[PDB]
């Protein structure tokens, strides 16, 4: 039986298990010579080592908790549960993998929390209409998506130091509007006003008192307020098992980290809570602004969603900022648009429109693969995110966990989690690296040797450099090494030169750069393969001529990533829906489509072609998207029958087509005016006459 187990595992039980997940070992002394010890279970079964003498662990993933997915967010009976299972126990062998799966559901009537950061600087004087009767305008539009709503709010101006603060005439310390001979309020860094409550009564009254303050420079640094409202959850009132929305409303641009050096502020933000009993940021004057990275980390740990409620003059700005804090939404604040009272509920749709998985505390040895089943059993490899969802949908992720080699340590515990939700799948990973052979041995001393022999897992291992099979494999004899063994077939040189067979066991360990092992000395430990001048592309360790890719890398050379971010396009769908993602680069598979994300396709048919498929499945219960059940996921554009179609000379794109009933359907779609793509259909298609 010349297999991989019989080759690299004949040393001991420890190194036999590490050869392949398919190897077995024979502990007992049943025929302890002339027979292989690391062969498979079945080849160790015929040659009978059948009893507990066989050391053969198997990898497994046991589920320790899986509560059923809840139907509603009202905690009537037990609690809310949006992920199943909850605790898997992973038991892993060296170089082995074991796949499992997880289901995620955005339940309905989920309790929502809304904290409101108000810019109270002077620029906002012309912008405080929004805060007026807010709790009514938060309740009157969120009730449709949830009961059990809580609201609170705070305010921020800027750091109360120079060069931001008006300190110069003493009467400007208490009235920054000393000039203009007006009256406004003293400035403050961040003021917590109202803890999250359920009474819009006390809210609307507490909001109407608010008036503006004044400082010098147009940046206002609410990022100090964002951080404190995130990590002071005890003071803010963030509830467990509730959507957390942090709404940020401001007039102009914002200070960023390192700006405070102009103020003599050179201490980085520590991300800790510093609001005390006075409800004031006690380190506003001593601590720099927070960096985007620190905000993102804390915004994700505390499962907070940041909403940017900003004005037209500055919308492009935070829109560009939001791309750096993934999962944040922007929204215009002006009555010159369709919906301003629906501003937050429009955003909460976007937040819940996707489910992306995140990993915490992943052991460095482990590497996770991800399939994604987002719609109707349509498995998508390499995706840990499903998009286009609505509140209520349910998605499934299939997960693989593989370890390279195996670490010797206690059991670790990492978390697989939906972004922005309390519910999590905790994976207790234990590594079955060693056999039950070391403890079961006699002491390592006084055994088969003249002085200090150490053995008794399976074989005699006596002395250094000699290690006799019985004992004392010695210097030049021409004894048992007769080229019978020490050569895979006796028509070949001895032990794969780079080594000569002295006794039965050839120590071929001629000191090449790196290391050398293998019974017949065939293993390399280097010279695996090179993509650039680096072996395994620098992303993989070399094991007997084979590249063991590091986490997030695959391929014979370990030069192909698992990333899909470079594959994503601006619209959100990967490769713009016209290509496959392979090695982090879109391979566009579609006629006449090209570009990094297949965004360019001037030969592709006009949108009049796919949008008509949504007209047929939503309005006529007909077409191809109806057969594949994809109409409710793909057709999210609101369609309306509009009674002899409207038209303005303001970029209305008109489309027509002829259905199965020989009737000419006519429709136009007003391209995104508020991001919304609305679709207008004429009733009474042109049908023939009798």
């Amino acid at each position: 039986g010349p297999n991989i187990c019989t080759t690299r595992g004949v040393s001991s039980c420890q190194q036999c298990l590490a050869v392949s997940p398919m190897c077995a070992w024979c502990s007992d002394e049943a025929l302890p010579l002339g027979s292989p010890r690391c062969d498979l279970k079945e080849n160790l079964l015929k040659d009978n080592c059948a009893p507990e003498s066989i050391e053969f662990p198997v990898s497994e993933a046991r589920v320790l908790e899986d509560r059923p997915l809840s139907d509603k967010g009202s905690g009537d009976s037990s609690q809310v549960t949006q992920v199943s299972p909850q605790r898997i126990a992973l038991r892993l062998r060296p170089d082995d993998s074991k796949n499992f799966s997880i289901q995620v559901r955005q339940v309905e009537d989920y309790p929502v929390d809304i904290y409101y950061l108000m810019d109270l600087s002077y620029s906002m004087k012309d912008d405080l209409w929004s805060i007026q009767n807010l709790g009514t305008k938060l309740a009157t539009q969120m009730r449709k998506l949830t009961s059990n709503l809580r609201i609170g709010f705070g305010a921020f101006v800027d750091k109360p130091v120079s060069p931001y603060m008006y300190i110069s005439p003493p009467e400007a310390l208490e009235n920054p509007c000393y000039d203009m001979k007006t009256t406004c309020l003293p400035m403050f860094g961040y003021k917590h006003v109202l803890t999250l409550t359920d009474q819009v009564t006390r809210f609307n009254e507490e909001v109407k008192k608010q008036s503006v303050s004044r400082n010098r420079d147009a940046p206002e640094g609410g990022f100090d307020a964002i951080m404190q409202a995130t990590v002071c959850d005890e003071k803010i009132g963030w509830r467990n098992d509730a959507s957390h929305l942090l709404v940020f409303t401001t007039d102009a641009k914002t200070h960023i980290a390192l700006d405070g050096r102009l103020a003599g502020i050179v201490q980085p933000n520590d991300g800790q809570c510093h609001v005390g009993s006075d409800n004031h940021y006690s380190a506003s004057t001593t601590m720099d602004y927070p960096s985007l990275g620190l905000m993102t980390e804390k915004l994700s740990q505390k499962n907070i969603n940041l909403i940017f409620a900003v004005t037209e003059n500055v919308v492009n700005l935070y829109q560009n900022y939001s791309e750096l804090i993934p999962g944040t939404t922007v929204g215009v604040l002006s009555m010159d648009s369709s919906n301003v009272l629906q501003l937050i509920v429009d955003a909460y749709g976007k937040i819940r429109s996707k489910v992306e998985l995140e990993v915490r505390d992943l052991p460095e040895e482990l590497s996770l693969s991800f399939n994604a089943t987002c719609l109707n059993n349509e498995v998508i490899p390499g995706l840990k995110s499903c998009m286009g969802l609505k509140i209520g949908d349910t998605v499934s992720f299939s997960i693989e966990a593989k370890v390279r080699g195996c670490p010797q340590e206690k059991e670790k515990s990492f978390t697989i989690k939906p972004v922005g939700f309390k519910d999590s799948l905790i994976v207790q990973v234990t590594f079955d690296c060693d056999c039950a052979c070391q403890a079961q041995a006699e002491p390592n001393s006084h055994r088969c040797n003249n002085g200090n022999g150490t053995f008794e897992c399976g074989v005699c291992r006596c002395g250094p450099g000699w290690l006799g099979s019985q004992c004392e494999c010695s210097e030049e004899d021409y004894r048992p090494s007769q080229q019978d063994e020490c050569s895979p077939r006796e028509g070949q040189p001895v032990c794969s030169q780079r080594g000569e067979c002295l006794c039965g066991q050839c120590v071929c360990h001629s000191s090449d750069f790196g290391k050398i092992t293998g019974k017949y000395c065939e293993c390399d430990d280097f010279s695996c393969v090179r993509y650039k001048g680096e072996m395994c592309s620098g992303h993989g360790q070399c094991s007997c001529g084979d590249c063991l890719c590091d986490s997030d890398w695959t391929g014979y050379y370990c030069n192909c990533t698992t990333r899909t971010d470079t594959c994503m396009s601006s619209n959100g769908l990967l490769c713009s829906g016209r290509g496959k993602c392979e090695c982090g680069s879109c391979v566009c598979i579609q006629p006449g489509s090209y570009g990094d994300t297949c965004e360019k396709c001037p030969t592709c048919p006009d949108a009049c072609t796919f949008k008509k498929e949504c007209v047929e499945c939503k309005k006529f219960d007909r077409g191809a998207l109806h057969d594949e059940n994809t109409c409710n996921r793909y057709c999210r554009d609101e369609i309306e029958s509009v009674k002899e179609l409207k038209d303005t000379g303001k970029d209305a794109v008109n489309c027509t087509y002829k259905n199965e009933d020989d009737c000419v359907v006519r429709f136009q779609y007003y391209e995104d005016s508020s991001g919304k793509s609305i679709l207008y259909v004429v009733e009474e298609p042109e049908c023939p006459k009798g």
Binding site: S291, L294, W466, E476, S527, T603, D606, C608
Partner: protein, 924 residues
């Protein structure tokens, strides 16, 4: 890599004074000594009424680490009236900027506040102080009569400062003009010659200064950082400044001329909020006498292994060329939240290799947030991205982060040992540390062994103790050293020799030293600097012909040498260090005489041959090329046989083929030495007679010059034998080919028009589009997908203008996207219009032709023609057989006429496509 890390000179100052916030060297011209300048912008002073005025200390390097305040100003606040201070020095951060030319010491106080002479205010204009040993002046170019956020009231000048070669001061202040920022440059002589202690707002002649701009530039913070260097023809240093809030928070870096503050060049960040331009540094890193720009973005978020944003920080290396152009590369941090680009400090030539070096600092990185400083060595290619040394902070946090590395100054050899040194500050722990450069030593070792081919029958040497007359040979080993800078003239190494290094793993060592009887030997050699390759001798011998094991494995003789690191610079023992990239050991091989014939010598016949299996490769692509090599030895044994595959400029090596058993897994490696890169492959030591090796070598070729016509390899086996030790050279040629998979694609939008048309009424003389009909748009695309490019091609469009003297698709306008000029043989838009089935295909219709001239399309470039036409409705509502369906057919063809690659078998590419617009009747 040569900074001494175990004997650093540590200086400390007052607690909570931010001692170490800024550092520089003091090299007075009236003293052979040198000093450390360290600012403490929060140190307390004897100035009356001034809480935390700040100091600048000079520190004696001799010994005892004494730091004493320089007295720039001992006075309190000047007064505007009886009890109405004119200035406020309390909490002014004096010393946050410190620069020193020869004897001038410029220190600044960027938070220095001022009560204007107009209204009671506190405006942080910032001040400076220039000391010339005896005379001390005040430089406050932002204390003008232009006072407010509107003007210079908040300029905070001296936030960043620097000197030029001609004693010009460059000063930055990021608060001028509603925080647009400002650069102000003044000659040093004018600063002292114009100083007037009774005048608060002094005008300096020859002042260079930026001016306020449009309000769009507010809050950009120009002057956050400054550096100087020449980026023009003149010898005059030009002005580099960081403006990290500029450009919608992308950040930018402005380069101004040194003569007249003219704008020269601009760098723009790639990522918002990253603080591109937090720091700048100018130095010549590639030894081309052209200053290079280094921009730091310490909050840069790059993509981790999983594609997730992580704040690691990024330093931008921009190499100046003969033209204005800059070759710019990027260099990312290593630990998250470490703030990698915080401080960038030129080192001069830390190793004296001939190329200048630089140090970048991640002051919040390291273990326990102690700080890290990475040393990067320059080379001819530019900066080497892999750091050669890591300076790790020693001090732990007390109240705030140590910030070790927040400030750094190099480029000055304070020990006068020939190598520059390096100060590093940590204002969180109130310390500053000076690292001294070690002297680099380049040692070349030789090892030669008398006859490599040992005959056991030939025993012409006696043996001590027993006189058996055994076979012997000699081992000679040479050692020479040389090193720049100060260095002891004689060095003491510890050389060690090992016989048969492949053995000693428990096998039998087959050679022993004669007198010592052992395979190991040691000796203390002592050499002098220079050349003079001083050698030594020893006598080793072989065991008995019937004693050890075997005769094919060769005797590897191993020499290693280690330098005893005493013999140091006598100053706390500044011990030297060996050159970084040098082998600390060399080894040669001796063979046993065996199967060499009666001539007593092995004379091989070496042959090499190779076939193509592809015979042609295409230009634009990266082609897999596998050469099948046959290396056979039909003569006597070949000691240390290796296959030498000399690859050309274009291609490189991938790996050996192991997917097939008919070929061999030869160990191969990519070598570069001595002006020629090549591939070596071990054929066996020895390569026995009649040995026929066969394997394949995978490659990847990319054409170098667009007119090359071929790729030639050269194959040769060579061996360490004395006679007949090389094979004939075999040159294999692979021919470059041209392949341009070009295709033309078309589409109509829409592709159907339904009749009748809504709100359509026949106008007498049609004027707009609504009076004519709907918009039919034909889009034609010519895309080159194949590897090879082309230089010229033609494109012809056939268009159905008329049928029976009746317009069909009235072309309004045609646009082009790409390298293409089009011309229509009939005037487009004669009427000046503002903003079964029957096929009509220009073979039965009046054809309007459009001819386009396509330029160079590369591997993935397209050329597109957009034809916006109107449906002539007046036609289709007539005895033009209304209720009859028509298919308006247009076609387009192309012919590729020219390719940039000459001397090559180009063959033409023609193809065509057709686009239809089916106008038909949906109802009667």
């Amino acid at each position: 890599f040569n900074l001494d890390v175990d004997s650093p000179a540590e200086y400390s100052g007052p607690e909570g004074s931010y001692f170490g916030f800024a550092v520089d060297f003091f090299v007075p011209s009236a003293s052979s000594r040198m000093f450390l300048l360290v600012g403490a912008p929060k140190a307390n002073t004897t100035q009356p009424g001034i809480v935390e005025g700040g100091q600048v200390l000079k520190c004696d390097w001799s010994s005892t680490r004494r730091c004493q305040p320089i007295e720039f100003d001992a006075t309190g606040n000047r007064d505007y009236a009886k009890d109405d201070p004119l200035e406020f020095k309390s909490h002014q951060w004096f010393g946050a900027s410190v620069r020193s030319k020869q004897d001038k010491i410029l220190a600044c106080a960027p938070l220095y506040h001022w009560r204007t002479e107009m209204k009671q205010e506190r405006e942080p204009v910032g001040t400076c102080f220039l000391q010339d040993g005896t005379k001390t002046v005040e430089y406050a170019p932002c204390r003008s009569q232009d006072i407010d956020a509107d003007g210079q009231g908040f300029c905070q000048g001296g936030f960043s400062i620097d000197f030029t070669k001609a004693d010009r001061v460059l000063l930055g202040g990021p608060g001028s003009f509603y925080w647009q920022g400002q650069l102000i440059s003044d000659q040093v002589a004018e600063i002292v010659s114009k100083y007037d202690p009774n005048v608060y707002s002094i005008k300096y002649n020859n002042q260079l200064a930026t001016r306020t701009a449009q309000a769009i530039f507010d809050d950009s913070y120009l002057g956050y950082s400054v550096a100087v260097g020449d980026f023009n023809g003149d010898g005059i240093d030009d002005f580099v400044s960081g403006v990290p809030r500029a450009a919608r928070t992308l950040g930018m870096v402005y380069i101004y001329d040194g003569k007249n503050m003219s704008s020269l060049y601009n760098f723009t960040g790639e990522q918002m909020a990253a603080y591109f331009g937090f720091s700048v540094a100018a130095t010549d890193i590639n030894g081309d006498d052209y200053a290079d720009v280094f921009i730091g973005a310490p909050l840069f978020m790059d993509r981790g292994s999983d594609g997730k944003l992580q704040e690691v920080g990024q330093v931008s290396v921009s190499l100046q060329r003969a033209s204005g152009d800059f070759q710019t590369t990027k260099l990312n941090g290593f630990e998250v939240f470490a703030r990698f680009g915080s401080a960038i400090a030129p080192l001069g030539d830390l190793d004296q290799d001939g190329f200048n070096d630089i140090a970048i600092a991640a002051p919040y990185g390291g273990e326990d947030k102690k700080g890290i400083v990475y040393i990067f060595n320059g080379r001819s290619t530019g900066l080497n991205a892999v750091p050669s040394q890591i300076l790790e902070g020693q001090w732990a946090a007390r109240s705030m982060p140590p910030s070790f590395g927040y400030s750094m100054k190099g480029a000055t050899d304070i020990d006068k040992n020939g190598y520059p040194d390096l100060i590093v500050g940590a204002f969180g722990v109130d310390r500053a540390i000076l690292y001294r450069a070690r002297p680099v030593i380049t040692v070349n070792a030789g090892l030669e062994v008398y006859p490599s081919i040992l005959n056991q029958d030939n025993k012409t040497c006696s043996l001590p103790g027993t006189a058996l007359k055994v076979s012997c040979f000699n081992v000679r080993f040479c050692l020479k050293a040389d090193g720049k800078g100060v260095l002891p003239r004689k060095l003491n190494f510890q050389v060690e020799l090992l016989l048969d290094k492949l053995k000693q793993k428990g096998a039998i060592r087959r050679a022993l030293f004669l007198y010592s009887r052992s395979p190991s030997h040691s000796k203390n050699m002592t050499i002098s600097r220079g050349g003079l390759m001083q050698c030594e001798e020893l006598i080793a011998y072989l065991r008995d012909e019937s004693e050890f094991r075997d005769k094919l494995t060769p005797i590897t003789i191993f020499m290693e040498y280690r330098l005893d690191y005493r013999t140091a610079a006598d100053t706390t023992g500044l011990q030297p260090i060996l050159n970084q990239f040098t082998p600390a050991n060399i080894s040669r091989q001796a063979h046993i005489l065996l199967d060499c014939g009666e001539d007593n010598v092995c004379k091989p016949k070496l042959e090499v041959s190779v076939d193509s299996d592809q015979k042609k490769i295409y230009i634009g692509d990266d082609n897999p090329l596998t050469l099948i090599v046959k290396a056979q030895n039909q003569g006597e044994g070949a000691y240390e046989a290796e296959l030498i595959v000399s690859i050309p400029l274009q291609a490189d090596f991938i790996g050996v083929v192991r997917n097939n058993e008919a070929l061999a897994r030869l160990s191969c490696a990519f070598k570069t030495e001595n002006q020629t890169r090549q591939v070596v492959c071990d054929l066996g030591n020895p390569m026995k007679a009649g040995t026929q090796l066969l394997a394949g070598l995978r490659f990847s070729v990319h054409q170098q010059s667009e007119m090359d016509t071929s790729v030639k390899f050269d194959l040769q086996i060579q061996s360490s034998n004395l006679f007949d030790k090389v094979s004939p050279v075999v040159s294999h040629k692979v021919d470059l080919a041209v392949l341009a998979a070009v295709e033309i694609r078309g589409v109509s939008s829409p592709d159907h028009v339904f009749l009748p048309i809504p709100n359509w009424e026949h106008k007498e003389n049609p004027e707009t589009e609504e009076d004519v009909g709907p918009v039919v748009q034909h889009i034609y695309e010519l895309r080159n997908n194949g590897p090879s490019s082309f230089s010229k091609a033609m494109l012809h469009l056939q268009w159905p203008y008329k049928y029976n003297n009746n317009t069909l698709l009235y072309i309004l306008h045609y646009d082009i996207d790409g390298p293409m000029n089009c011309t229509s043989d009939m005037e487009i838009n004669p009427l000046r219009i503002k903003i079964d089935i029957h096929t009509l295909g220009c073979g039965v219709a009046q054809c309007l032709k459009i001819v386009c001239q396509v330029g160079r399309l590369d591997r993935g470039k397209s050329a597109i023609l957009y034809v916006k036409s109107l449906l002539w409705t007046e036609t289709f509502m007539n005895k033009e057989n209304q209720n009859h369906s028509y298919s308006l057919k247009s076609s387009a063809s192309f012919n590729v006429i020219e390719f940039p690659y000459k001397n090559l078998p180009i063959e033409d590419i023609t193809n065509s496509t057709l686009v239809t617009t089916n106008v038909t009747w949906g109802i009667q």
